[PDB]
Amino acid sequence: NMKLGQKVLIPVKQFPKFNFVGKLLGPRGNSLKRLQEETLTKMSILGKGSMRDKAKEEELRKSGEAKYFHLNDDLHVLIEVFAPPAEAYARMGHALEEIKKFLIPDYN
Amino acid sequence: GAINKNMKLGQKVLIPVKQFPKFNFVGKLLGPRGNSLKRLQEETLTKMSILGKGSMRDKAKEEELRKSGEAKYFHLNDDLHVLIEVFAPPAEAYARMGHALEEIKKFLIPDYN
């Protein structure tokens, strides 16, 4: 068994008005949690703008604690997997395909 | 990274030489009758190279290259392995890697064929 991790950009700069976080979570907040289970991965929204309170986010980023280093990156989904190699890579490929629709706007 | 942007992946697969020191792993992968590594690359859309200690079967040259300190020979410091590489968009890169990792398994299990 091995761990894989892959960041996937949430393209905020490119589409600054689209509610990506709401798209990812769905109206009940369940959607990303469900998708991680469907693909046998773990998926977390990390990076700048990923905390609810902007001021706290800046404090945490300035703290320099390792657990907040992610706050220096652009907003992203981190997909992680732990499985035997062939299966780890397959799960990641599946997750990467499934996440696509949530990372582009669905209206102009 | 961006979901659509082509990316490189690389993954080492150990060849179990110490466990099976009389079995010719390399010959079987490279032999002209099987063309087995070539075929595996084509079927999986990955690229594969045999690297690490013993990958040259010219032990003296291998040592000289290891001792040269040239970056292209750093791999000689690792145990014998297949390096599987791919360049594709992320979803496809990972899926192709997974297919390659499944398909290589049969070459790493010694039998009498």
Numbering used by the authors:
A (entry chain A): 53 to 160
B (entry chain B): 48 to 160
The authors write:
The KH domain of T-STAR adopts a classical type-I KH fold very similar to KH structures of other STAR proteins. Surprisingly, the KH domain and the C-terminal half of the QUA1-KH linker of T-STAR provide an additional dimerization interface. This novel KH/linker interface covers 1,065 Å2 per monomer, almost twice as large as the QUA1 dimerization interface, and involves mainly the C-terminal α-helix 3 of the KH domain and the C-terminal half of the QUA1-KH linker. The KH interface is stabilized by a network of hydrophobic interactions involving residues A138, Y141, M144, G145 and L148, and an intermolecular hydrogen bond between Y141 in α-helix 3 and Q58 in β-strand 1 of the KH.
T-STAR is a tissue-specific STAR protein mainly expressed in the testis and brain3426, and regulates the alternative splicing of CD44, Tra2β, Tau, VGEF and Neurexin pre-mRNAs262728. STAR proteins are defined by the presence of a highly conserved RNA-binding domain, the STAR domain, also responsible for homodimerization, and composed of a central KH (K homology) domain flanked by two highly conserved regions, QUA1 and QUA2. Here, we have determined the X-ray structures of the T-STAR KH domain in its free state, and in complex with AAAUAA; KH-QUA2 in complex with AAUAAU; QUA1-KH in complex with UAAU; and the full STAR domain in complex with AUUAAA. Taken together, our data reveal a unique mode of RNA recognition and dimerization by the STAR proteins Sam68 and T-STAR that is crucial for their function in alternative splicing.
